[PDB]
């Protein structure tokens, strides 16, 4: 009942306000027998000398709490370092307003830092509680800071872990970025448009100028910033509409001081009403006065749930932040301070105004982007994708078909060779065939912009243990689809349960099977015969490494002895195997039924067998969370229902001589 309140004051006006708050605090705790000390220390420029003077003035009266009632901290870097470092040894919480920096909120090194100032972590929590109805989990972290940026990144990671979701591009940057245009170009390409800047005002003004230069300010982009990020010189280039969260009870020294005094009084009252009220020894200088009940005292002070008339619920956060600060989100519409919401403690409900954007609409904007950036990756599918070399420097002369009609073809800029041959030498070719016609029909039905590009490699990839940080995934075009390089694999990949675990498929367009190419023991009569089921070292036919046939041999349960034998004649593409089997070099070749049929119709020496197996419709590989996963499938289905795709296949793939 002798719990004194040690206040760290700087100005005489602050002293008068603290005295008035102590005088009026009789109604808060019901006029309890606690004696609030009137320690009034003067302000000192030196950080360590001021800390020593405060420690002496507080040990002369043996106070039990810290109350910083001045926004300007004695430290030169505007950080609450001296008070925290002088209160951590005595295990005394610092219940005062020092600054809005969030790096000191996370209790990592210090164990007795209980600052009741809402940091950027509280701002992130309020933004998370507000975006529950907006569905904006994808946030582009663009904060260029080494302490506040890392704190915001950790807070966003914790929020995404608690929300059971994932982010789009979370990464911290260094303060003083000059090539900020590349960041905006990268954020524009991604579907997320939640631009968050919480480092300083210089970077805020820089990114505002960068967005205004490209006319991308408010046009679907989310700009959630605080008062510290717009203070100083940050709104000189940002138009009216930037959502600026004003720091409630963060800088005021008229009513915020009284509110903090009342909160500390209620906290010490509830602590005295509970147990663990042992008085610590005299913490003088030059003596070890480590409080043995430090953690217990902090645990008792943590549970300080009271019933206030202003705020509904009051509870500390995971880092000991303010007990549910009522952050009133403001907006810069016409350079005003209209309120668009209030953090009551469970949800931010708008009172009179809603979200306003300078380049968007007053209603819910379009944060996520459309699917008009489908990068169509092509591979060696000559019977379907006629990859023809370029005739000139970008000019593709439309050759006449069998009906004398110039077929429209799209250029395919990509490495014509494999990875060792051409690493990044993207050579444009004149790709034509049924794939280009299908892409044109899809772009005519829908409104997406397809991108035709050739894959750098020449294989599909296997699901074995790769040599890249032990990632048991596909190493090829399917792996590039997972990373973000590819968006829609137009190649008819073989549907299976292994490929269905990572990504999904679309409506199958080419319903084919799997057979063997012969040169008509001359006959092979399929694969069930024991002549080829268990071959010898000199009886290995043509096979392609990391292909559909490789996956089919891997998934097989009785052909394990033949799966290991195919490792001798592994090639990088199917063209090599075709050239080998067409020049009397190997025995046979297993590939797609339509491809082998086209090769038999073109090349008279190659006569494939008639036994067809594995009759399954190979679907188009699609992404995992693509918004148009069903739209492209419905379009392909509608195109296949009518007599267009069948006629195109009969006129292009069915080349009978």
């Amino acid at each position: 009942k002798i719990v004194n309140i040690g206040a760290v004051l700087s100005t005489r006006k602050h002293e008068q306000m603290f005295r008035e708050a102590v005088n009026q605090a009789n109604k808060r705790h019901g006029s309890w027998k606690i004696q609030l000390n009137a320690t009034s220390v003067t302000h000192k420029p030196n950080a360590i000398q001021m800390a020593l003077s405060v420690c002496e003035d507080l040990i002369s009266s043996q106070v039990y709490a810290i109350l910083v009632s001045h926004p300007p901290t004695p430290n030169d870097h505007f950080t609450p370092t001296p008070v925290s470092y002088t209160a951590g040894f005595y295990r005394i919480p610092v219940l005062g307003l020092t600054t809005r920096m969030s790096i000191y909120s996370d209790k990592s090194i210090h164990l007795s830092f209980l600052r009741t100032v809402p940091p950027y972590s509280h701002q992130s929590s309020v933004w998370f509680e507000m975006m529950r109805v907006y569905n904006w989990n994808h946030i582009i972290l663009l904060v260029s800071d080494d302490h506040e940026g890392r704190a915001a990144q950790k807070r966003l990671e914790t929020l995404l872990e608690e929300r059971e979701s994932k982010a789009e591009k979370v990464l911290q940057f260094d303060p003083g970025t000059k090539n900020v245009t590349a960041l905006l170009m990268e954020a524009r390409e991604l579907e997320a448009r939640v631009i968050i800047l919480s480092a300083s005002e210089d970077d805020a003004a820089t990114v505002y100028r960068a967005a205004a230069m490209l006319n991308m300010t408010g046009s679907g982009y989310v700009w959630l910033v605080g008062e510290r990020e717009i203070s100083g010189n940050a709104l000189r280039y940002a138009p009216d509409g930037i959502i600026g969260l004003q720091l409630i009870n963060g800088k005021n020294e008229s009513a915020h001081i009284s509110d903090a005094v009342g909160v500390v009084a209620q906290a010490v009252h509830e602590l005295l009403e509970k147990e663990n009220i042992t008085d610590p020894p005299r913490g003088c200088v030059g003596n070890t006065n480590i409080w043995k009940t430090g953690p217990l005292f902090k645990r008792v002070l943590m549970s300080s749930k009271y019933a206030d008339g202003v705020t509904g619920r009051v509870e500390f956060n995971e880092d000991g932040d303010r007990k549910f600060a009522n952050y009133s989100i403001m907006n810069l519409q016409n350079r005003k301070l209209v309120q668009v919401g209030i953090y009551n403690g469970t949800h931010v409900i708008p009172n009179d105004r809603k979200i306003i954007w300078p380049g968007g609409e007053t209603e819910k904007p379009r944060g996520y982007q459309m699917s008009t950036r489908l990068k169509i990756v092509t591979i060696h599918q000559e019977p379907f994708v006629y990859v023809k070399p370029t005739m000139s420097d970008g000019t593709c002369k439309e050759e006449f078909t069998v009906n004398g009609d110039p077929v429209k073809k799209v250029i395919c800029t990509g490495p014509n060779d494999t990875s060792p041959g051409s690493p990044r030498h993207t050579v444009p070719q004149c790709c034509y065939g049924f794939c280009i016609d299908l892409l044109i029909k899809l772009a005519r039905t829908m409104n997406f912009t397809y991108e035709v590009h050739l894959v750098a490699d020449g294989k599909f990839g296997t699901q074995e243990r790769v040599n890249n940080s032990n990632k048991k995934e596909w190493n090829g075009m399917m792996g590039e689809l997972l990373s973000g390089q590819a968006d829609m694999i137009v190649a008819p990949l073989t549907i299976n349960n292994e490929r269905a675990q990572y990504i999904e498929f679309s409506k199958p367009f080419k319903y084919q099977g799997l057979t063997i190419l012969v040169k008509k023991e001359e006959r092979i009569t399929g694969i069930n015969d024991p002549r080829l089921r268990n071959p010898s070292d000199k009886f290995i036919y043509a096979t392609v490494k990391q292909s559909s046939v490789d996956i089919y041999f891997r998934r097989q349960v009785e052909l394990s002895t033949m799966y290991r034998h195919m490792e001798k004649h592994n090639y990088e593409s199917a063209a090599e195997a075709i050239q080998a089997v067409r020049d009397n070099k190997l025995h046979a070749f297993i590939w797609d039924s339509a491809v082998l049929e086209f090769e038999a119709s073109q090349k008279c020496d190659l006569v494939t067998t008639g036994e067809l197996f594995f009759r399954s419709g190979f679907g188009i590989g699609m992404r995992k969370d693509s918004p148009w996963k069903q739209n492209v499938s419905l379009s392909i289905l509608k195109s296949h229902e009518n007599g267009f795709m069948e006629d195109l296949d009969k006129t292009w793939v069915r080349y009978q001589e």
């Binding site: 360590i48 002088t86 090194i109 890249n468």
Partner: protein, 387 residues
Amino acid sequence: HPQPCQILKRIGHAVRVGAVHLQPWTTAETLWPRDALLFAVENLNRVEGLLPYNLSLEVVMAIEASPWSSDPFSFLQSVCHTVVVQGVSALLAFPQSQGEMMELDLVSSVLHIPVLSIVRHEFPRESQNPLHLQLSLENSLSSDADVTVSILTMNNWYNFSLLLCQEDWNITDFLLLTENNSKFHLESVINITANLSSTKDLLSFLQVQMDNIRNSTPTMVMFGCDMDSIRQIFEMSTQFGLSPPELHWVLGDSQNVEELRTEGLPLGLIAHGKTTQSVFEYYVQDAMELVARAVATATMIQPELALLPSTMNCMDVKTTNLTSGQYLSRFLANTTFRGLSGSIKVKGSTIISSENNFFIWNLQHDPMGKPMWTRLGSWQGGRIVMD
């Protein structure tokens, strides 16, 4: 060459190093900072050329004038009052506890002086400041994991047996390095205290584990097991005849050479040992050599950089366009040399850990009959020169 004959009038043309935290180590062992500083000064004076440009690290003993084991006030106020009498140039700290370590951040923020944190155990790195360095000269696992990765890459072994006996170690860095490298294929961990009070069940579990790892992963590397587990494994290996071709036992964690087991070693095992020790005097000497190299680099960059004191009072901070603390904290991070007790490799001036020099001691079948540590390879900080 601009002559800096206008700033050495207050410091006496000598780097004034602050000898703060002179209280003997008593908390968790019995080190002596005075003898360590004396030996460091003697070693610096013996080998000439460490301090060029006619410079000398003036180690000024700042003592207040064990109740003073973790008191920041006595080791801060009087220390600054006695050290700003002629200009603060350098400062070497000795954090004994958290109270003596947290004050270094405030000192570096209010004076802009690069300080060195010689801590005993691992402390968090919430304050990611370049001026507040952290030199945790301890037996870490990063160098051992790097040696293991190099051995697995030079011998074409992608599988390994994770000997996870306990979890109160620094295996976090091991997992961080494992998530980056693709030469780790773990199938079953080897435990020793998995609720086995008697001995028959323990022996049966060990037999099952060894019969499983004979064909799964014939590479058992020590990554956190205590000396008792290694002793038991070496005792059971001779009784069961676990040959290196059958069970290749690898000793990854190399703490010291005197603590390494030298009895019951199978002919053909990988048992490495850290040649350097955990002597505090060697750590102080390495810190002094690092400070000397940093001062030399600063003088080579700008003659008025290292001689110019960063602060001259207990509250003065260098916040000009051409400071000295930032340059001093950024120059030593690039020119990393090889110290006495391990190569001093600055890791971003925040997680600095001296990588000790190792030697590949693969005790193969000795023809003469005497077990000797054959030096089949070498380790010069990442590179391995085979013979």
